[PDB]
Amino acid sequence: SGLEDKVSKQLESKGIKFEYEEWKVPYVIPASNHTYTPDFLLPNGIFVETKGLWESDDRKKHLLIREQHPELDIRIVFSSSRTKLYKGSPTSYGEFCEKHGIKFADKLIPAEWIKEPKKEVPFDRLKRK
Amino acid sequence: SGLEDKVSKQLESKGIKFEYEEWKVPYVIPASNHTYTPDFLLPNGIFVETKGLWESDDRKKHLLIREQHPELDIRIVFSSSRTKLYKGSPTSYGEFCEKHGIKFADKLIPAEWIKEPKKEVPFDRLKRK
């Protein structure tokens, strides 16, 4: 940077010996608690989230929720699952979902999902509104 | 949204009783591990970070570092300590530092800091670049 150079030029001019970016300090960012509210809950126990732009954080949230709540069946309906993860990415929302076993579809809830046999939803583990 | 509207219309048209944003799924964002590399380390054991823009995440980082490594003396030299935290915020970088006990200066490292008596830095706690 320009700032680092000024400071650097300062110390040297005054003959101050110093160390630069020589040392690393470890630290941990504490685990945090959050909640996610799926857009729709179908009678057969299927949760459905609708999504246009699907940002990095949101993808991680889904991967985390699947790891933490494997008995939850949460699927996604995209305006377009072809959209690429980011600017010049080669990977698309749909591809990502396929890689992680996230069931998805475009524009509307597929007819077959609505018809899957109802399953138990662990509501005790959830918090209402 | 167009997507939430179309999907709920599709559901209503098929007679599906669905709950909308009725349930909160709790989840945890895992603790993460990092390392911070101060820009300079003076002979007397004082570390100095040079900062221009200083974002919300960078600030939060500084507080975690002070908490986890209270044995280190980490100070900040800003391009301007008058800069506001974020657009609209009334609080400046300099006021954030005073509120949290972080020593700071503007543009160049204060001569009086350079002159403070040496304090041994516990390098066993740190990791070389």
CB contact under 8 A, A50 and B7: yes
B95: closest CA of chain A, how far (Å): 21
- By C-alpha distance, which of A70, A115, A2 is closest to B79? A2
* Chain B residues within 8 A of A39 when measuring between CB atoms: 4, 7, 20-21
Rounded-to-5 percentages of helix, strand, coil across chain A: 30, 25, 45
Residue of B nearest to A52 (CA): B3
Tokens for B9, please give them.
Answer: 């219309």
CB contact under 8 A, A1 and B77: no
Query: For the purposes of burial, counting CB atoms within 10 Å of the CB of B99, is it exposed (0-12), middle (13-18) or buried (19 or more)?
Result: exposed
Residue B3 host element (H or E):
helix B2-13
Q: Is A97 helix (H, G, I), strand (E, B) or coil?
A: helix
Q: Are A47 and B22 in contact (CB under 8 A)?
A: no
Going from the C-alpha of A72 to that of each of A5, A67, A120, A127, B87, the distances in angstroms are 54, 10, 9, 14, 40
Q: At what angle do helices B56-68 and B93-100 cross, to 10 degrees?
A: 20
Is residue B113 less than 8 Å (CB to CB) from chain A? no
Rg (CA), chain B: 24
Q: Strand pairing of A74-78 and A104-106?
A: parallel
- By C-alpha distance, which of A5, A23, A44 is closest to B107? A5
Query: How far apart are the C-alpha atoms of A94 and A39, rounded to whole Å?
Result: 19
Q: Could you name the CATH architecture of A1-129?
A: 3-Layer(aba) Sandwich (3.40)
* Chain B residues within 8 A of A60 when measuring between CB atoms: 29
Would you kindly state where each structural domain of chain A is located, as residue ranges? 1-129
Tokens 């989840």, residue? B27
Query: How far apart are the C-alpha atoms of A9 and B28, rounded to whole Å?
Result: 46
Q: End-to-end distance of chain A based on CA atoms, in angstroms?
A: 49
Q: Are A103 and A77 in contact (CB under 8 A)?
A: no
CA angle A76, A77, A78 (to 5 degrees): 110
User: What experimental approach yielded this model?
Assistant: X-ray
Query: How far apart are the C-alpha atoms of A125 and B25, rounded to whole Å?
Result: 8
Q: Are B102 and B60 in contact (CB under 8 A)?
A: no
Tokens for B111, please give them.
Answer: 């001569």
Going from the C-alpha of B96 to that of each of A127, B60, B82, B93, the distances in angstroms are 36, 11, 10, 5
Is residue A53 less than 8 Å (CB to CB) from chain B? no
Rg (CA), chain A: 24
User: In sequence order, what are the beta bridge partners of B46?
Assistant: B73
DSSP A51-73: ESS--HHHHHHHHHHHHH-TT--
A82: closest CA of chain B, how far (Å): 16
Query: For the purposes of burial, counting CB atoms within 10 Å of the CB of A56, is it exposed (0-12), middle (13-18) or buried (19 or more)?
Result: exposed
- By C-alpha distance, which of A72, A73, A83, A127 is closest to A107? A83
Going from the C-alpha of A129 to that of each of A67, B11, B46, B67, the distances in angstroms are 23, 21, 51, 36
- By C-alpha distance, which of B79, B75, B53, B46 is closest to B62? B75
Tokens 């939803």, residue? A121
Q: Residues 8 to 47 of A: which have CB under 8 A from any B CB? A: 8, 10-11, 14, 16-43, 47
Choose among A24, A33, A43: nearest Cβ to B17: A43
Backbone angles phi, psi at B24, to 5 degrees: -105, 125
List, edge to edge, every strand of the sheet that includes B19-20.
Answer: A104-106, A74-78, A47-51, A40-41, B19-20
> E strands of A5-91, at which residues?
19-20, 23-29, 32-36, 40-41, 47-51, 74-78
Non-local (6+) Cβ contacts of A122 within 8 A are A69, A71, A72
Q: Are A64 and B27 in contact (CB under 8 A)?
A: yes
Q: How many CB atoms are closer than 10 A to CB A76? A: 23
The amino acid present at A71, given as its one-letter code, is E
B81: closest CA of chain A, how far (Å): 13
Query: How far apart are the C-alpha atoms of A55 and A61, rounded to whole Å?
Result: 10
